[PDB]
Design a protein around this nucleic acid. Structure first.
Lengths: 173, 33
RNA sequence: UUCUCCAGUGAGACGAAAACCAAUGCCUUCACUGGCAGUAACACCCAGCUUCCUGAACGCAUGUCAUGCAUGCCAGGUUUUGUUGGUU
């Protein structure tokens, strides 16, 4: 609703800062919960305004992530099911067998979109060091720079959605 | 552009939370029926 | 009458319901394999330049190559068939 702010410090005078902050544009405080401030600090949730709250504040003394949820940092960024995306690749300049096994691999291996590029490697390796080696500023496949990084997608998730999808298709009719 | 995505998201979230679901209920009846 | 690729509506660099056909998407398999669950557009480098009944946190879900720090929390009170072109 408004802004769940997490970081300083540890170690904080979170409460003191919050009390001072009241005043517009800001109103409603309290120091909570896991980490370390929520202030509302309306209205789009997370929030649009919160970008400012980075350097504004500290003083004191670091600072800042904000979120609205989920908000462990682990699921969305760190891991997750060790999905990768490989970019650039191109549909009529590759075959489904070509890029597949050259990147481990995979399975499951579905190129998008056309656009073009951004092709899920639904991977196994797991994905930790694979990113570091195929991003690289190289190695050039098939002539482009080749940038490979993380997702933040999948695995079994998509599979479950296929199962409910499958029974819905057979049922309709 | 951010305002135009916000309305894309919105207008098609309400197609999910209505038009998809209520239809799914019907079709999910026929399996047991 | 430029060279780099994979099978010609080819690309890359450089100088209000529904279905028949082709393309193309998405899902699924391994394979254009089977098929409409999903849903602004895009051939990278800029992924948006109150009656009546059902029911009750700052985190759950949608979404995460995201400054998506973005939406979502009430059922009653000639279009469709995924999409465009062709056909019925």
């Amino acid at each position: 609703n408004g802004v769940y702010v997490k970081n300083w410090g540890t170690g904080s005078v979170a409460d003191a800062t919050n009390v001072f902050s009241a005043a517009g544009k800001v109103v409603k405080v309290q120091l909570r919960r896991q980490r370390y401030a929520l202030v509302f600090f309306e209205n789009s949730a997370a929030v649009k305004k919160a970008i400012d709250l980075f350097n504004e504040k500290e003083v004191l003394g670091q600072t800042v992530l904000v979120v609205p949820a989920k908000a462990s940092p682990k699921p969305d960024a760190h891991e997750n099911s060790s999905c990768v995306f490989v970019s650039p690749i191109f549909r009529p300049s590759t075959t489904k067998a070509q890029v597949m096994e050259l990147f481990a691999g995979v399975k499951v291996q579905r190129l998008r979109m056309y656009r073009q590029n951004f092709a899920y490697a639904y991977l196994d390796s797991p994905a930790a060091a694979k990113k570091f080696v195929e991003e690289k500023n190289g190695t050039a496949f098939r002539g482009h720079t080749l940038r490979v990084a993380l997702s933040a997608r999948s695995l079994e998730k998509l599979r479950a959605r296929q199962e409910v999808a499958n029974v819905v298709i057979a049922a309709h009719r | 552009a951010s305002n135009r995505r916000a309305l894309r998201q919105r207008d098609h979230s309400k197609k999910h939370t209505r038009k998809v679901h209520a239809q799914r209920a019907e079709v999910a009846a026929f399996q047991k029926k």
